[PDB]
């Protein structure tokens, strides 16, 4: 089944990665935004 | 704001880089150590 899309640490800047099905979400610290916390 | 300090792949020897705020961390394979898995 689907693997772990967080294994590559896609979330920058201390963001917490949650694995989804063929995708991932980043939970960013306050005041970082963007899909990977890059803003 | 803060950039991706994993730019340029600082972790050696198969290590995995995680971007933090103004810093990065490496996970290193068993048998390797140092900040950048260089020891
Ligand atoms: Ca997945
Ligand atoms: Ca390099
Ligand atoms: Ca960073």
Swiss-Prot record, chains A, B:
Modification type (3R)-3-hydroxyaspartate: residues: 19
Glycosylation sites per record: 8, 16
In-chain residues carrying the UniProt-annotated modification Phosphoserine: 23
Coiled coil: none
Effect noted on mutating residue 22 to K: In HEMB; mild
Effect of residue 28 to F: In HEMB; severe
Domain of life: Eukaryota
Disulfide bond residue pairs: 6-17, 11-26, 28-37
Domain EGF-like: 2-38
Effect of residue 19 to N: In HEMB; severe; Oxford-D1
Protein residues bound to Ca(2+) 7: 2-3, 5, 19-20
Name of the protein described by the UniProt record: Coagulation factor IXa light chain
Organism: Homo sapiens
Parent sequence residues shown: 92 to 130 of 461
């Amino acid at each position: 089944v689907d693997g772990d899309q967080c294994e590559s640490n896609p979330c920058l800047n201390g963001g917490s990665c949650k694995d989804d099905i063929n995708s991932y979400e980043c939970w960013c610290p306050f005041g970082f935004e963007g899909k990977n916390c890059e803003l």
